[PDB]
Subunit: 120 residues, 3 copies
């Protein structure tokens, strides 16, 4: 469960893990460069959930690496996706191509308990 806005996020099928995000305009990424690709996507997630922007296999096989895509529950702005080319030739992304995906997960990073000294 989430709410979302934007033209650069596609409806997904039920048996996909994530929503596809689409490139806003043509962009070239030469080898070893990093580019920050903007989107107009905004999401709202429920308590103790977070968005994870990660890669699609078709663009990972060309060397596209997404880094830093943890979208906290408190993040209210537009998603920006940090991409580096770790491949061996330039990557050309065309406007409207699917380049990343957004998966919504619950975390359990809350509710600290006392240390069990007998563990192990």
């Amino acid at each position: 469960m989430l709410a979302y806005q934007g033209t650069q996020i596609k409806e997904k099928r039920d048996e996909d893990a994530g929503f596809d995000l689409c490139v806003p305009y043509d962009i070239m990424i030469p080898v070893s460069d990093t580019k920050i690709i903007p989107t107009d996507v905004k999401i709202q997630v429920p308590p103790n959930s977070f968005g994870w922007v990660t890669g699609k296999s078709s663009m990972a096989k060309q060397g596209l690496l997404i880094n830093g895509g943890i979208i906290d529950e408190g993040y209210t702005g537009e998603i920006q996706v940090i991409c580096t080319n770790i491949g061996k030739s330039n990557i050309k992304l065309i406007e409207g191509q699917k380049f990343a995906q957004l998966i919504i997960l619950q975390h359990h990073s809350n509710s600290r308990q006392p240390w069990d000294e007998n563990k192990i």
Copy 2:
């Protein structure tokens, strides 16, 4: 909960997060190269779950990076693992070595709700 087939996936202990995957044959990965390592592993996961192929610390400390390992619930083929060497010397993987692990997670990427305009 999952079902799985294949000779390149090991039984795991209960206190590991993931199943180990094993290299099919000896392979060298020179620095800056990417190789796609095939497996004979197939999985079936329940609704709203997905497989994540990710790295083991022992091979990340040598520069092995896995990229693009999201295995949707709809994916019925054999897993292939995309690996790049971001280390500073060649990586030699021997047949039957544990090189990656598969972790099964539930997503919540479904059930869209209306946007809350009062948030924040």
Copy 3:
């Protein structure tokens, strides 16, 4: 839910996904190098959960990549964080800077079921 010890993990807000980890001493990471940054952080998680050490957007935009941060439920030692610089200039981490984050997730990598031959 987890238990944790250490001076290099910060309390978090409820609407963050993860806890921030802090650098132990000043460290330089030249481009293409990998360094293993030690922490004094130890965690205990409940059954079928695991820690994931991953990146913060502010350090991914400079080229800091974290690799191999799956912390099993059986892992009782101090966390060490494997970092590579895939950026285009040196990265300087100062003592006490927030450089990574720890997110606690549940996995479902247990309970094998029979293969459904009719799937698809």
